[PDB]
Design a protein around this ligand. Structure first.
Ligand SMILES: OC[C@H]1O[C@@H](O)[C@H](O)[C@@H](O)[C@@H]1O
Ligand SMILES: OC[C@H]1O[C@@H](O)[C@H](O)[C@@H](O)[C@@H]1O
Lengths: 299, 299
């Protein structure tokens, strides 16, 4: 019958899930980044189309998508037209909006997305509010890019002899395949503006942290608390006592722990939640075309 | 007679001073950035040639230059060949080396350059040692770029309502001609990789600081201390009780004050010095070709 696809077009990757209109799962698909600021509009759209095609096993009737990078009116006006050519019916929203809707389903609340970039999104019963979520230079506190940059800067200070070399040191050098200061410099000058390459270093930080390296742990702690502070601010403003946590950074057990500890000390409850942003997009699509959301229930 | 030109090819601008071989001043000239990482090799060389031509009022016989951006073997091998076509005799060194030589004239010591980028350079009697000075992404703590980025990130948090808007807020918006969050985002996406545009914001921070804005002062303090800590490390390693301070950031009275206060609390004496990096290059050229450095003395 009808094929409805929900999509999370993020900075790290694009994830899509397809369902019919009767709540039944059809399939899933993944592709590259959906943030056009990082891969360009042509490729971002191509990646979304690919993820959708894979999940639907062909053409889709309705596509709902949460998108990273729609940070200005300019961003929206150039993205919308192209994204609408993907299927007969297409629904587009900022990724923070979809991630939050996926969980609160129309009710007030706050969600945090911590992936290649980051954002805190809330809903006060009347409108959506955003804190951060404006790119790597201006924002993205506690994101993978933010963590990767901090690690790179720390590694140089270790090479300079300013600080002792820790586990993090070799984890980073191996990740980007660099053996000395000279190679690190060259890597930086040709990788400086490639957000994905810097963000990829967050994995090295997580590995070093899991092995007890306080230097790596400090980076994760600072990033998590910088972002968590924004979540606490918005939660208090909206009047909610809980915040939902989504994104690849929360797959870092230590990062997640520092984030939850901060929220808890500030009287806020954290919840990873049961609903992904992509299924949130499916739900929004269901509402748009009239499919019964309760049919998605399964056990 | 013989025309000798000393050049400081930095991240902010290129400055040149011409003298004959008898210690007499001929003229000075300025042009754009000499750091090829920021303007490309073609333009960097063009800027150096222009500054030299202006100062010498024509062709020069000898050109000595301190250059920002020679941070790897790769950088040197591509820069040297072109720079040698500027005059019959050309001497090339990293800018930190020349800035330090200008003051200690062959003796051990430590110098700090804080301009668009930053670096701490020392000499232990046998070789030159560098700390930092590897570009905007990996380093440049307390540089104009570093300060500009911190200001931009703070301004967004003010727009988000996370912190109260201070004097700094409007100083920044006016500097980059932006009126709201939407325009700031667009500016960021088209100015993100233009180091000069981000570094230009340091002026706004200085203005706000001079007017008593603690938020702007905090940025200058953090940057100055991050860089000053590196200077203290190198001064102690080399065994010197003083550090020379050079660069446009020291024209910020508050930045300079925070820098000197930190050094002093750590038992180190600061000195702006009497000799510029460009005259340091003239002195090195004098040594190379056999002109008497003492002839430069004047009153
Ligand atoms: O995906 C999380 C956030 O990442 C940031 O880099 C983007 O600018 C935001 O639009 C997005 O919400
Ligand atoms: O000019 C100060 C420093 O600025 C940095 O951006 C450059 O990478 C260094 O080579 C230079 O020494």
């Amino acid at each position: 019958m009808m094929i409805i696809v929900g999509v999370d077009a993020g900075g790290t990757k694009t994830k899509a899930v397809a369902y019919d209109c009767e709540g039944n799962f059809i399939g899933e698909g993944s592709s590259g980044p959906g943030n056009y600021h990082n891969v360009g509009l042509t490729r971002a759209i191509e990646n979304i189309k690919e993820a959708v095609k894979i999940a639907a096993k062909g053409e889709a009737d309705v596509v709902g998508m949460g998108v990273a990078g729609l940070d200005s009116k300019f961003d929206w006006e150039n993205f919308t037209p192209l994204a609408s050519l993907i299927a007969p019916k297409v629904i587009i929203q900022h990724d923070g909006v979809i991630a939050l809707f996926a969980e609160t389903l129309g009710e007030p609340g706050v969600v945090v997305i911590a992936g290649t970039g980051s954002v805190v999104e809330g809903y006060n019963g009347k409108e959506f509010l955003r804190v951060g979520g404006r790119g790597w230079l201006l924002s993205d506190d506690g994101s993978a890019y933010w963590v990767g940059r901090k690690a790179l800067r720390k590694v140089l200070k270790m090479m300079d002899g300013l600080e002792n070399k820790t586990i993090l040191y070799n984890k980073v050098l191996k990740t980007i395949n660099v053996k000395d200061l000279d190679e690190l410099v060259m890597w930086s000058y040709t990788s400086s503006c490639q957000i994905d390459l810097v963000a990829s270093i967050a994995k090295a930080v997580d590995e070093a942290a899991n092995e007890g390296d306080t230097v790596a742990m400090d980076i994760l702690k600072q990033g998590a608390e910088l972002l968590a502070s924004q979540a606490v601010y918005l939660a208090r403003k909206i009047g909610t006592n809980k915040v939902y946590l989504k994104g690849g950074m929360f797959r870092s057990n230590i990062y997640h722990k520092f984030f939850t500890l901060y929220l808890e000390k500030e009287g806020i409850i954290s919840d990873l939640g049961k609903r992904s942003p992509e299924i949130g997009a499916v739900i929004l699509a269901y509402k748009e075309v009239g499919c019964d959301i309760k049919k998605l229930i399964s056990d």
